[PDB]
Write a protein that binds this ligand. Structure first.
Ligand code: IEZ
Ligand code: IEZ
Length: 263
């Protein structure tokens, strides 16, 4: 039922990763909602369950596969399937709890983790912050294997959490931000793994706020500036949507678009 996008870390190139992220974005957004040239994800309100999720099937050089489930309203990774078992993060609300019952329905073993899937919880379990977790094709290759082997006891909980953190950033954050996609393209081009710098971290942390600021803006102008960081950690202020057009690829729905002013 739900659309499937395939990606493999096996012989991954800049182009194959670019095709993948483009395909993910294409299945996340409908084209119905574009504001200041930036697409908005489907509104959760009144969204039919048959349109709620996309599936991301990740394969690796080790000949293993896992399937991530993403909520189309926010690109949130809600859980995964590896062979005969499926695992879901502790849902944040009753609606999201009902929604996940529609995923991986023919799987033999269904588990819901007792922990939620936000970075804060995952970093706690990993024993490391995002700033110290390396990203790139190698980390993703290893993450796929780690998710695959969880059900058989091969993967410790910290490794599982770290592996989720890798997948979320390389798929969902890359889908959300052209800038983050670019940072991952660079790592793939040179086959060099590295932890995300402050520019990546602050963008991830600010996605909700940026989405709201753009959507609530007066003709693109922010009421309140948003502070982001450069690669070197120095602060710069965002006052307007204009500067974000090359940076943010999609937004979470925050409010209705205002009517146009006419002469
Ligand atoms: N499973 C999963 N988890 C995710 N978690 C995050 C995430 O934790 N974002 C943070 C961003 C943030 C961080 C700090 C703040 F002060 C405000 C926002 C949050 O919402 O608290 C963001 N995205 C995802 C995701 O796509 N899938
Ligand atoms: N399907 C699903 N979605 C979830 N979404 C969030 C979450 O933080 N949602 C935010 C939107 C958001 C989503 C991701 C971000 F990186 C930032 C903001 C909200 O409710 O305003 C948090 N948890 C979940 C979850 O457990 N399942």
């Amino acid at each position: 039922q739900y659309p499937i996008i395939n990606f493999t870390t096996a012989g991954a190139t800049v182009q194959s990763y670019t095709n993948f992220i483009r395909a993910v974005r294409g299945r996340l957004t409908t084209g119905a909602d574009v504001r200041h040239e930036i697409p908005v994800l489907p509104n959760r309100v009144g969204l039919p369950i048959n349109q709620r999720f996309i599936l991301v099937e990740l394969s690796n050089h080790a000949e293993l596969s896992v399937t991530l489930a993403l909520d189309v309203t926010n690109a949130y990774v809600v859980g995964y399937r590896a062979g005969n078992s499926a695992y879901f993060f502790h849902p944040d609300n009753q609606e999201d709890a009902e929604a996940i019952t529609h995923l991986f329905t023919d799987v033999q073993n269904r588990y819901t983790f007792a922990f939620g899937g936000n970075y804060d919880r995952l970093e706690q379990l990993a024993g490391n912050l995002r700033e110290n977790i390396e990203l790139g094709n190698g980390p993703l290759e290893e993450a796929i294997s780690a998710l695959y082997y969880y059900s058989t006891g091969g993967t410790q909980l910290p490794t599982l959490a770290r592996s989720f953190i890798i997948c979320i950033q390389m798929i969902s954050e890359a889908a959300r931000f052209q800038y983050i996609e670019g940072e991952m393209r660079t790592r793939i081009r040179y086959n060099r793994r590295s932890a995300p710098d402050p520019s990546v971290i602050t963008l991830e942390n600010s996605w909700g706020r940026l989405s709201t600021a753009i959507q609530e803006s007066n003709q693109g102008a922010f009421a309140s500036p948003i502070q982001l960081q450069r690669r070197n950690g120095s602060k710069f202020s965002v006052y307007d949507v204009s500067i974000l057009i090359p940076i943010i690829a999609l937004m979470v729905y925050r409010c209705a678009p205002p009517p146009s002013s006419q002469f």
